[PDB]
Amino acid sequence: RKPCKLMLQVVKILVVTVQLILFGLSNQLVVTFREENTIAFRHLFLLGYSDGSDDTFAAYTQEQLYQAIFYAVDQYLILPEISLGRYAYVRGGGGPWANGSALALCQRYYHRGHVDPANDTFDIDPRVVTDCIQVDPPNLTLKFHKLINVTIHFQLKTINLQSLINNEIPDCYTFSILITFDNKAHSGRIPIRLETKTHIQECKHPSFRLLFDVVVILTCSLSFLLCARSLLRGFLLQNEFVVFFVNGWYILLVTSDVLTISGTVMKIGIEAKNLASYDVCSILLGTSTLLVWVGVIRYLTFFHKYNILIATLRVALPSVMRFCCCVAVIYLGYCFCGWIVLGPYHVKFRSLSMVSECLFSLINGDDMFVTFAAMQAQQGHSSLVWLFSQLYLYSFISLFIYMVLSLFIALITGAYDTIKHPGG
Amino acid sequence: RKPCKLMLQVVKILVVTVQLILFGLSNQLVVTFREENTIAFRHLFLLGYSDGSDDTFAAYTQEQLYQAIFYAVDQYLILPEISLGRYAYVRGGGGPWANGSALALCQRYYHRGHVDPANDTFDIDPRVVTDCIQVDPPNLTLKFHKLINVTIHFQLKTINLQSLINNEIPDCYTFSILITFDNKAHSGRIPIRLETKTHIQECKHPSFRLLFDVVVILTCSLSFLLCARSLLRGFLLQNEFVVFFVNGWYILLVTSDVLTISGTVMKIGIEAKNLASYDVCSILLGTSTLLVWVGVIRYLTFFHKYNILIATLRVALPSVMRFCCCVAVIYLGYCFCGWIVLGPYHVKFRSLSMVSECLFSLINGDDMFVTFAAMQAQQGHSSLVWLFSQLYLYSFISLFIYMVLSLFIALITGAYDTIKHPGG
Amino acid sequence: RKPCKLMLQVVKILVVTVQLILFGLSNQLVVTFREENTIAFRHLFLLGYSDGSDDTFAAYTQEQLYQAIFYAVDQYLILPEISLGRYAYVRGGGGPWANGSALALCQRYYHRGHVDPANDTFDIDPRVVTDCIQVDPPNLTLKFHKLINVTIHFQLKTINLQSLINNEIPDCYTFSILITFDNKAHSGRIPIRLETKTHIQECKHPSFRLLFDVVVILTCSLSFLLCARSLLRGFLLQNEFVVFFVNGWYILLVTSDVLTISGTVMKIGIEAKNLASYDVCSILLGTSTLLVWVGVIRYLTFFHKYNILIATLRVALPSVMRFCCCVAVIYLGYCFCGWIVLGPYHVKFRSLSMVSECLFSLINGDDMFVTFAAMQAQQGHSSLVWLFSQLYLYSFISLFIYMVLSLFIALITGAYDTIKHPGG
Amino acid sequence: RKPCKLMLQVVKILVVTVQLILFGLSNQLVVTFREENTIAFRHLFLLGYSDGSDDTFAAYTQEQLYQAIFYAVDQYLILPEISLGRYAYVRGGGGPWANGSALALCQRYYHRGHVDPANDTFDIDPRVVTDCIQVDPPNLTLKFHKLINVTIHFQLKTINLQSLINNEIPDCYTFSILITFDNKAHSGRIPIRLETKTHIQECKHPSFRLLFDVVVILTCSLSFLLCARSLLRGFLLQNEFVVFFVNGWYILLVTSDVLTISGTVMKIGIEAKNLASYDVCSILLGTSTLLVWVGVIRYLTFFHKYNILIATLRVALPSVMRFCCCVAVIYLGYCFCGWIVLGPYHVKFRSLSMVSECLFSLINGDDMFVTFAAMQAQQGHSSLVWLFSQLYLYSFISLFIYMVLSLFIALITGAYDTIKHPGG
């Protein structure tokens, strides 16, 4: 009934989530097509594209420069001539107007770009002059001092005829190519990178599963109306309590309400500004479905045989707040020691993210023999610091390792006392 | 006697399992020959076969296509001319009839294969036309739009004369070559793959260990008759119990009975439909031999000095069912958060298998510094989601890490209470 | 007030440390420029520089030798001709005087360098003759027996115009190139290595954040005067105690005093002998800021609700000293077994550092499946020792693994007793 | 006195072990020279030697064969012409007599080597005919059916003049080259391998640290006489006990006696049959020095403040024998499931060594996310078995993971009871 409604809401948020696992699969296979297209293009225009070489994909010869310039230039010259597929290159003007390349060959560089590092002086009217080449589907050079960045802005239509294997009509995908030579470092190292964007459109010559998803939304609507009715009844009870853990009698209906607001935003309403907000609304659904797990298990305990382990959770968190506080404060001191020591010989201590990453090395066995062995092997320097890196890292491994069993077990021997009260 | 029969059955299932470790070694060395042949062929026909390049083994040039076409084509032209071994290529017609290549050079592609992705339209009479070339042991081209897949169906006899070093007569192995160009993606990426199958036959000019294995089977027969007699005696006892842990007094005789049915199926009866069912029957033997371990240790406890630790197991599972239930329900919520969050930046969260794989990262130290460090390093996107991936992953690492010591120790401090009852 | 001064000192050492995280970021990005320059140069002069090939960067052909000699020689010939940047090569004489290369092409080798390893004899007047070639910005050979080491000592100015993107004037960086051919092994293997040093100077044509850092120093001065006043008050109390944990009432003011002495040494006083001592003074700050964490959490416990977990620490360390002693003594025996067993088949057991590194394999899951699986796979030798490496490593994994839970839990069940005294 | 003798024996076995760490360093640096020579040679003769390519170092072309044959052949032709060192190639006949190559170019192959794998028959008079070519320091071919293995047996003197940098006279090292083409598989895959052996001799034109080591031996002699006197006194006490843990009152003197017998065997007596027996005697020393750690800590407990933790060890092992028994018996069942399941899709389950290696994956976090993630990714086969590998591996991860905390903590909550008896 009403708990059958709660079990139906667990099952129906679970079924909206099954349709979400379905749609997340559907978008995932679409993204398989996307990533296949991505790697395909990365090889494809990639004059010299090696696996992992995109990390190194920076030029050193100036002739190393202009050659790859020619290389893609021929790529665009003869793409229809060479392709294992069919690319659609119509006018495609960008990114400033006027008019169409479709490949816009653009290049930024400072206007008074005056500089003499042998003279210890420079005259930056660094107003970046962008020089652009439009190139119609059927050679020049720039100052190695002078440039800022170089841009190849092309675009290529394609038909998703593999969708014929998904039983779909093939869609229209315009792959929009931004090729970027980036010499903003100007340090003699200039990475090259290629950006592409796919304008998925339907076929020009041109939904029962869609009816099912909209039903999952409207049933989410009914279930949220149920969750709001239950919040009003618990609100009637709390007004009796003010005028007179399980912890989720109301808030779960709310947080379910929040995940539901996020997913319904994903289907239609924010579903026309697509990508990231859908990713977010599905994120909010992730919290709702975790709770669908946790709270459904609450109800289907059916008291869980008195719920001794469910009773296990309570008084510890009363202490656990300050304890996790204390564990953080030592850890923040240790993160400070990492931010101090990380710069001289490390990449693992490279930022606050990396000081977080070494915290994964702390509790997890994966970071230990790697980091504390390799850094003891001394990339290193300044042999007092070779002593210091070992004396820091071996020191950092120990205190938490000994103390952490004692904390989960100080609360764990605390759990034998709330089980000393509670084993009876 | 009868426990000497149970110890003899532990030893005799252990000896059927020693003969299984023997035969699993024997098949394992045969598979070493198979895998050696596999890598040998993979290099061998492999025009361009690199280690791990089979992962990348997809073409981009159409000329990149037809060249490898020629490459193997010469491979087949002059295999006897080039080989470090001796391959036997007799008529070998397949895979449809008519008649013999031995290399059948086949190629699928849709009949009304009409398509214009610049026109947003297509006319699939996609009825795949398979065009096949037979090629007698002693050039043409296809539409890059038009094809579906391309097949090289060859076959090569060989003699297992290294079996002379195993003291055996060399057997006759016909390696049956299926070379596959797969452009079913049609995304400009077409992986190539080569399949080979070995028809192991005896020498044309043409078993005490075999007598030993059949004895192990018939003695398995006697031991199962013993296990069935013991089930009937325990059944006489249970009929006295109905009419009036150790847990395996009967079921182990049964599950031993099941592993025994599976292995005897492996030797003779299902041993003429070979491969996978033998793998399965040996799987069932694996469960039988684990139990041979566990229950032999039961009997050879001889009460284990009162069996305090054997008494340790019981009442916890009465709670442990619902507890492992609860651990799963949080974990299923966490798997749902993974299925939500995994698609945008990850391969580790790529499927339900990968959400299971990150669960290995949860309890095991190997997944932690890799995943939570590398994903915090942000393949990433959409910096609220760069906050979100860390805020999810660091959140997911903690709750189970703290709680799990408390669970095995909530039942562990429970074990000090069934040892508080039980230490006396 | 005074605890507001202690909280202000926690916040102000925390703010000197926030300015330290700021400066450590600032030096870190400068080091990003440095490392970018480093990898840039390593590719740059690197005739044959491959990623990780610096590990293998040793020659075998003598012609393999002199060619790379020519290769860099042309590198220096035509660096201005080839560069994607602007290098400043003025006279730059070194490393002995007279006068200027700027590339000094030097080569050591023993004077009576007489040797015949077919004759079992040699006449070392091994007085290394250093032959040097100065080479003006706009071929010869040496005995393969005769040389000791070979040196290319060059230097290159450059302007840090990317500092224009940091809003700074570009600084003047003189990159000082030491190219080293090292045949001191004389074992036919001669690694090549290139050293470079950057003399960062300001622009020739030529500080509110600096005012802020000096304020952080002077406020560190006031806070240390506070810490010294508090030590004098606690000293007045201890003189009352002699004449009549929390543990850090005085020593933390001291160790804060030490980190503060180290950082103020970093800003100005030792800040003219820069690199390593600043690294050290920041190290001492790392200890101060960890304590800022730990002791601020002490005060902001505000008794922590009676500080039961803070009371948790005490009596155990009274035992924990001897216990960590005992854990070390077994571990030192195990390190001795490693120093014995490591040499025959291992690199992980390669030194006392590596015997420390296998200790990371002990408690951390990362070293186990790698080392005990790969060494059981037997690089190996002398099959009794193939038994011995497994029998040692599997033995070493177990005793600590079983005992360590019992130690943290012997003290942990000790913590249920100081919580048996202390849960009341 | 006598405990000063025991502390002196701890220190003197520790000093014999310090001289052992010294000699193990000395042999380790000698082995650095050896391994440097090893990698040097591996590149050196290595026509095509790539890092890790020794794993793949097998030929496929027959011309791929004979070319490398020529390649080393020229290696030997012009080694003095090409070398960055000085190799001494005198007559050096082997491995059968007659007379000298120094490169013996040998090749085995069966005498009646008759075989037709197209005919399903063969006539093995497989009596391997070895054909040998001697080649004086200043072309032919064999049947691809016919050969067994091919051998290049050379030898090269060299002088260890880098020992001049160790202050030593350079020794005489004869590097004895065995080059092996191995086609014993005859599977078209023939790995090539090169063996070299170094005859270290002194210089032809030709020990205070040695006096120190012999003193360490004779003092080991005095300390063993002390250990034997202490065994006789404890034997007088045990004869009083028969006629009327600490556990090592006698046996440690013995096991110290055993390690001492092994090391004294290393210095002189077995020190003329060198390599492996010295490795062994040092192994026995490893056990002695571990005990030097453990028992010295016993005495220097000085009762360890009543030795509560030393008292901690005792009664558990009375149970721990059968418990480690039970842990093994489940684990042997699990190893049996691994030996069953490992062959179809795995290399980690490849032998009993690998079933041991997955046991490292069990307790250590390193094997988990790798194996259970990658095998769930399905190298795989036969989708019921794709279910089976996950259903086995995920099953195997759990039971020990839950139970093992309960075992070390069943004995650990047992330790709170021998600390319940023992905390008083």
Neighbours of D269 (CB within 10 A): 12
Alpha-carbon gap, residue D377 to D397, rounded angstroms: 17
D401 touches chain C (CB under 8 A): no
Strand partners for A175: A156, A198
DSSP state of D136: -
How many beta-carbon pairs below 8 A join chains B and D? 225
CA neighbor of A263 nearest in space, from D47, B340, C414, D241: B340
Q: Is B4 exposed, middle or buried (0-12, 13-18, 19+ CB in 10 A)?
A: exposed
- Write down which residue in B278, B301, B324 finishes a domain: B301
Helices (H), C45-124: 53-56, 62-77, 79-82
Alpha-carbon gap, residue C56 to D39, rounded angstroms: 11
Residues C263 and C350 in one domain: no
| B272 three-class SS | coil
Chain A residues closer than 8 Å to B190 by CB: 84
Residue A34 belongs to a domain: no
Q: In sequence order, what E strands does A206-269 have?
A: none
Residues in chain C: 424
D112 touches chain C (CB under 8 A): no
Alpha-carbon gap, residue D105 to D94, rounded angstroms: 10
Residue C219: both structure tokens together = 């406020």
DSSP state of C313: G
Alpha-carbon gap, residue B309 to D326, rounded angstroms: 10
Give every strand in the sheet of D190-195, ordered side by side: D58-59, D190-195, D178-182, D149-153, D103-108, D131-135
Residues A342 and A282 in one domain: no
Alpha-carbon gap, residue C332 to C325, rounded angstroms: 10
CA neighbor of B7 nearest in space, from B298, B213, B233, B260: B298
Residue C155: both structure tokens together = 């230097």
Residue A256: both structure tokens together = 């379910």
B372 touches chain A (CB under 8 A): yes
Q: Output A376-379 pairs: Cβ under 8 A, ≥24 positions apart.
A: A376/C353, A376/C356, A376/C357, A377/C353, A377/C357, A378/A345, A379/A345, A379/A346
Chains touching B (at least 3 CB pairs under 8 A) are: A, C, D
| C245 three-class SS | coil
Alpha-carbon gap, residue C303 to C284, rounded angstroms: 29
Report whether the peptide linkage leading into residue D72 is cis, meaning its omega lies within 30 degrees of zero. no
Alpha-carbon gap, residue D358 to D379, rounded angstroms: 17
Residue D156: both structure tokens together = 């090269």
Residue C139 belongs to a domain: yes
CA B141 vs CA B62, B75, B178, C356, D105: distances in Å: 10, 18, 20, 63, 50
Contact C351, D21 (CB under 8 A): no
Alpha-carbon gap, residue C169 to C191, rounded angstroms: 39
Hey, of C366, C403, C411, which one would you mutate to test binding to chain A, going by the most A CBs within 10 A of its CB?
C366
Contact A338, B372 (CB under 8 A): no
Residues B78 and B184 in one domain: yes
Q: In sequence order, what E strands does D196-233 have?
A: 198-201
| C350 three-class SS | coil
Alpha-carbon gap, residue A263 to A259, rounded angstroms: 6
The rounded Cα D102 to chain-centroid distance in angstroms is 31
Residue D204: both structure tokens together = 């032809």
Residues C6 and C55 in one domain: no
CA neighbor of A279 nearest in space, from A32, A39, A27: A27
Residue C70 belongs to a domain: yes
- How, if at all, do strands C131-135 and C103-108 pair? antiparallel
Alpha-carbon gap, residue C387 to D280, rounded angstroms: 12
**Which of C322, C333, C377 lies nearest to residue D294, judging by beta carbons?**
C333
The sign one gets for the Cα dihedral B29, B31, B34, B36 is negative
Contact A136, A160 (CB under 8 A): no
Residue A126: both structure tokens together = 């660094």
Strand partners for B110: B128
User: What is the identity of the amino acid at D34?
Assistant: R
Instruction: For tokens 């620490």, name the residue.
Output: C313
Alpha-carbon gap, residue D269 to D266, rounded angstroms: 7
Alpha-carbon gap, residue A329 to A310, rounded angstroms: 29
CA neighbor of C152 nearest in space, from C91, C198, C98, C194: C194
**Which of C164, C204, C360 lies nearest to residue A372, judging by beta carbons?**
C360
**Which of C21, C84, C291 lies nearest to residue A190, judging by beta carbons?**
C84
Residues D14 and D64 in one domain: no
Contact C309, C326 (CB under 8 A): no
Chain D residues closer than 8 Å to C350 by CB: 28
SS (H, E, C) C127-185: EECCEEEEECCCCCCCCCCCCCEEEEECCEEEECHHHHCCCCCCCEEEECCEEEEECCC
Contact C364, C370 (CB under 8 A): no
Neighbours of A303 (CB within 10 A): 9
B90 touches chain A (CB under 8 A): no
- Structure solved via: cryo-EM
Q: Is B50 exposed, middle or buried (0-12, 13-18, 19+ CB in 10 A)?
A: exposed
Residues in chain B: 424
CB contact under 8 A, C120 and D276: no
Alpha-carbon gap, residue B338 to D198, rounded angstroms: 58
CA neighbor of C289 nearest in space, from C311, C259, C316: C259
User: What is the identity of the amino acid at C113?
Assistant: G
Alpha-carbon gap, residue C188 to D37, rounded angstroms: 9
**Which of B144, B372, B405 lies nearest to residue A360, judging by beta carbons?**
B372
Instruction: For tokens 């005696």, name the residue.
Output: B233
Domain that holds residue D343: 313-415
Alpha-carbon gap, residue A211 to A218, rounded angstroms: 11
Torsion angle (degrees, nearest 10) of CA D206, D208, D214, D218: 150
Residue B88 belongs to a domain: yes
Strand partners for B135: B103
Contact C266, C282 (CB under 8 A): yes
Alpha-carbon gap, residue C357 to C341, rounded angstroms: 14
CA neighbor of C250 nearest in space, from C271, C225, C232: C232
Count of domains forming chain A: 3
Alpha-carbon gap, residue A46 to A37, rounded angstroms: 13
Q: Which of residues 123-152 of A touch B (CB under 8 A)?
A: none
CA neighbor of D335 nearest in space, from B209, C81, B18, A183: B18
Residue A83: both structure tokens together = 């392709």
Helices (H), B243-351: 251-264, 274-301, 316-341
Neighbours of D366 (CB within 10 A): 31
B423 touches chain C (CB under 8 A): no
Contact C283, A388 (CB under 8 A): yes
| CB half-sphere exposure, A345, CA atoms < 13 A | 21
DSSP state of D21: H
Residues C295 and C341 in one domain: no
Residue D373: both structure tokens together = 């993630």
Phi/psi for B295 (5° steps) reads: -80, -30
Phi/psi for B221 (5° steps) reads: -65, -45
Q: Is B383 exposed, middle or buried (0-12, 13-18, 19+ CB in 10 A)?
A: exposed
Phi/psi for D342 (5° steps) reads: -75, -30
Alpha-carbon gap, residue D71 to D78, rounded angstroms: 11
How many beta-carbon pairs below 8 A join chains B and C? 6
Residue of A nearest to C85 (CA): A188
Report whether the peptide linkage leading into residue C104 is cis, meaning its omega lies within 30 degrees of zero. no
Residues C296 and C328 in one domain: no
Q: Which of residues 251-310 of D touch B (CB under 8 A)?
A: none
Contact B261, B287 (CB under 8 A): no
Chain A residues closer than 8 Å to D366 by CB: 365-366
User: What is the identity of the amino acid at C231?
Assistant: L
Neighbours of A276 (CB within 10 A): 13
Contact C104, C134 (CB under 8 A): yes
Q: In sequence order, what E strands does D136-186 have?
A: 149-153, 156-159, 172-175, 178-182
- Rounded to a whole number of angstroms, the distance between the first and last alpha carbons of chain B is 35
Residue of D nearest to A370 (CA): D366
Residue D11: both structure tokens together = 């220190």
Instruction: For tokens 């996609």, name the residue.
Output: B126
Alpha-carbon gap, residue A368 to C360, rounded angstroms: 6
Phi/psi for C362 (5° steps) reads: -65, -60
CB contact under 8 A, D366 and A364: no
Alpha-carbon gap, residue D275 to B201, rounded angstroms: 48
**Which of A283, A293, A301 lies nearest to residue B340, judging by beta carbons?**
A283
Q: Is B25 exposed, middle or buried (0-12, 13-18, 19+ CB in 10 A)?
A: middle
Torsion angle (degrees, nearest 10) of CA B80, B81, B84, B88: 0
Residues B239 and B92 in one domain: no
Report whether the peptide linkage leading into residue A99 is cis, meaning its omega lies within 30 degrees of zero. yes
Give every strand in the sheet of B178-182, ordered side by side: B58-59, B190-195, B178-182, B149-153, B103-108, B131-135
- Write down which residue in D177, D201, D225 finishes a domain: D201
b/e per residue B354-370 (b: at least 16 CB within 10 A): bbbbbbbbbbbbbbbbb
**Which of A44, A279, A356 lies nearest to residue B376, judging by beta carbons?**
A356
CA neighbor of B44 nearest in space, from D63, D56, D117, D61: D61
b/e per residue D243-253 (b: at least 16 CB within 10 A): eeeeeebbebb
Residue C226 belongs to a domain: yes
Residues A263 and A318 in one domain: no
Residue C294: both structure tokens together = 């730990």
In Å, the largest CA–CA distance within chain D is: 88
DSSP state of B267: I
A207 touches chain D (CB under 8 A): no
Chain C residues closer than 8 Å to B366 by CB: 365-366
CB contact under 8 A, D62 and B39: no
- Write down which residue in B170, B201, B232 finishes a domain: B201
Residues B294 and B329 in one domain: no
Alpha-carbon gap, residue A344 to A346, rounded angstroms: 6
Residues A186 and A49 in one domain: yes
Hey, of A366, A370, A412, which one would you mutate to test binding to chain D, going by the most D CBs within 10 A of its CB?
A366
Distance (Å) from the C-alpha of residue D330 to the closest C-alpha of chain C?
A: 16
Contact D102, D77 (CB under 8 A): no
The rounded Cα C213 to chain-centroid distance in angstroms is 26
Residue D360 belongs to a domain: yes
Contact A194, A179 (CB under 8 A): yes
CA D61 vs CA B44, B73, B81, D68, D117: distances in Å: 9, 17, 10, 11, 20
Residue C318 belongs to a domain: yes
Hey, of B364, B372, B420, which one would you mutate to test binding to chain D, going by the most D CBs within 10 A of its CB?
B364
Residues C172 and C242 in one domain: no
User: What is the identity of the amino acid at D424?
Assistant: G
Chain A residues closer than 8 Å to B369 by CB: 357-358, 360-361, 364, 366-367, 370-371
Alpha-carbon gap, residue B59 to B47, rounded angstroms: 12
CA A258 vs CA A212, A250, A286: distances in Å: 22, 12, 11
Strand partners for D106: D132, D151
CB contact under 8 A, B366 and C365: yes
Q: Name A39's Cβ contacts closer than 8 Å, sequence gap at least 6.
A: B189
Residue C423 belongs to a domain: no
Q: Which of residues 327-366 of B touch C (CB under 8 A)?
A: 364-366
Hey, of D321, D323, D397, D402, which one would you mutate to test binding to chain B, going by the most B CBs within 10 A of its CB?
D402
Neighbours of A274 (CB within 10 A): 11
Q: Name C250's Cβ contacts closer than 8 Å, sequence gap at least 6.
A: C230, C231, C234, C235
CA neighbor of C216 nearest in space, from C254, C259, C251: C259
Alpha-carbon gap, residue D319 to D329, rounded angstroms: 16
